[PDB]
Amino acid sequence: TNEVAKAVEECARAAKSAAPSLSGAPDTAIDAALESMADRLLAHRDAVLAANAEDIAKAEAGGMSAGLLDRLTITESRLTDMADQLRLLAGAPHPQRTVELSTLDGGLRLVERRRPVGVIGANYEARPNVTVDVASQLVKSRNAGVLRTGSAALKSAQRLLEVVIRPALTDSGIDANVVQLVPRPEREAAGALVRLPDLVPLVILRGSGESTRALALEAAQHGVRTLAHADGGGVLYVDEKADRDTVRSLVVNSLDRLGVCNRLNLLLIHDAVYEEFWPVVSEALAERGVSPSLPPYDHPIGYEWALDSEREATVTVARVDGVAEAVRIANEETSGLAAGIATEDARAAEEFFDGYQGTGVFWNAPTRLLDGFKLLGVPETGINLDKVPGPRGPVTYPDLYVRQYAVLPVER
């Protein structure tokens, strides 16, 4: 039997049928539902944490790693973080859904409308808080959702859906079926979620590496769009006119977390200052317990260390001829997520900005800042690396809409 594929389709049809309820909800109701989720999460701590305790106990009996148990575990900090983010999202602005453009010939007028996508899918790790984060962002943007979480977090996610997410929607006058959670432990569910172009045309993929890379390819092959950043890794180019203090700071502050997509991965150093800056670069790398990878390399120049658990505390270093070579390497050998330049020469920075084609470009600023919250003050839906018009780089809730034109009588 096709039980896994069947459960995903069922969730999608249920989300689609309920979606009009969310589409027609006024701003006050959407915001009240988000505020209420925050209140319920804190009011029902005992129930939520109890569900989580069972997942944690179950994961330990299966021999889960201490790092993945950390991600599964809901602490007080993460509980209060969840609620604070829900309230921030509730207070965030709603763009105007109908803008009058002009009158047209024949006693008519034109309006540009923002409509929801409909049903958006999401695949992510066994981290309970992600269920609330994703659910809340789709609700804010009037999109129903089909969520797929790592199986180790199912009970936690289901309790959050039951006690936090749904009652809040219902009290605000929204059909609670607009948020669906795939009830299957099977990892195959993720694949089934990117194969329903008629029901779930867009899927948010939160993962990193080979698994996300495969899901993103499978989706594209089935006509399903994604918001994904399978391959990351920031580039930093140290120019001839760089400042020692700034470089030291950039290196240290781009390596605070070694498993993320927007950390420093490839360090390019202008040949003319290599010898002078290496002592500063070495001091900075040592500060973070990171070792340089020098030629001859054992992997491609753009190899992303964050995806190699065993060797994550590593950074690839290359000496380059100038800005033009730095740009070419950045564009041709990396995924085009983020790249920065360290320099005090405005002309060198301008050339780097004009040449680099990635989603975020930086001048004397760490690539670790490429994040929706850090840049825009609103939660990040998930970075997208497409090379075409539409959402790109950090994605936030106002990106999750489709355009529609409406024409009607001028006096109506």
Contact residues: a second copy, CB under 8 A: 20, 23-24, 101, 104, 106, 108, 110, 113, 115, 117-118, 197, 201-202, 217, 220-221, 223, 225, 346, 349, 353-355, 357-365, 369-370, 374-376, 386-394, 399-409, 412
Q: Is 211 in the site for Ca ion (CB under 5 A)?
A: yes
Taking CB under 5 A as the criterion, the residue among 100, 256, 275, 332 binding Ca ion is: 275
Contact between 324 and Cl ion (CB under 5 A)? yes
- Please tell me whether residue 105 binds Ca ion under the rule CB under 5 A: no
Binding Ca ion by CB under 5 A: which of 209, 292, 302, 322? 209
Applying CB under 5 A, which part among 34-42, 143-151, 357-365, 385-393 lies near Cl ion? 143-151
308 binds Ca ion (CB under 5 A): no
Taking the complex as a whole, the smallest distance from the CB of residue 295 to a second copy amounts, in Å, to 26
Task: Name the minimum Å distance from CB 245 to Cl ion.
Answer: 24
Q: Which residue has the tokens 């109701």?
A: 29
Q: List all residues 6 or more positions away from 1 whose beta carbon is below 8 Å from its beta carbon.
A: none
DSSP string, 306-318: GG-GGG-SEEEEE
The neighbour count for residue 267, using CB atoms within 10 Å, is 25
Interaction partner, residue 358 (Ca ion, a second copy, Cl ion, none; CB < 5-8 Å by kind): a second copy
Binding site annotation covers 125? no
Nearest approach in angstroms of CB 242 to Cl ion is 18
- Please provide the distance, in angstroms rounded to a whole number, between the alpha carbons at the two ends of the chain: 54
Indicate the SS3 state at residue 148.
strand
Q: Does 183 bind Ca ion (CB under 5 A)?
A: no
Choices 35-43, 51-59, 248-256, 364-372 (CB under 5 A): range interacting with Cl ion: 364-372
What CA–CA distance (Å, rounded) separates 308 from 210? Answer: 11
Distance (Å, rounded) from C-alpha 34 to C-alpha 40? 10
Residue 207 within binding range of Ca ion, rule CB under 5 A: yes
Spatial separation of the C-alpha atoms in residues 121 and 134, rounded to whole Å: 10
What is the DSSP secondary structure assignment for residue 86, as one 8-state letter?
H
Tell me the C-alpha distance between 5 and 190, whole Å.
9
**Residue 388 touches which of Ca ion, Cl ion, a second copy, none (Cβ within 5-8 Å per kind):** a second copy
Determine how many CB atoms are found less than 10 A away from the CB of residue 266: 24
Secondary structure of 189-243 in HEC code, one letter for each residue: HHHHHCCCCCCCCEEEECCCCHHHHHHHHHHHHCCCEEECCCCCCEEEEECCCCC
Residue 332 labeled ligand binder:
no
Closest CA to 272 of 226, 237, 310: 237
Q: CA–CA separation, 211 vs 274, rounded Å? A: 37
Q: What minimum distance in Å lies between the beta carbon of 118 and Ca ion?
A: 12
Find the part of the chain contacting Ca ion (CB under 5 A) among 5-13, 92-100, 207-215, 290-298: 207-215
State which of residues 123, 131, 137, 384 lies at the interface with Cl ion (CB under 5 A): 123
Among 325, 333, 344, 386, binds Cl ion (CB under 5 A): 325
Q: What is the C-alpha separation between 115 and 142, in angstroms, rounded?
A: 9
The residue ranges that bind Ca ion (CB under 5 A) are 24, 107, 197, 207, 209, 211, 223, 243, 245, 275, 287
The residue ranges that bind Cl ion (CB under 5 A) are 26-27, 98, 111, 123, 150-151, 187, 196, 198-199, 205, 207, 212, 260, 321, 324-325, 371
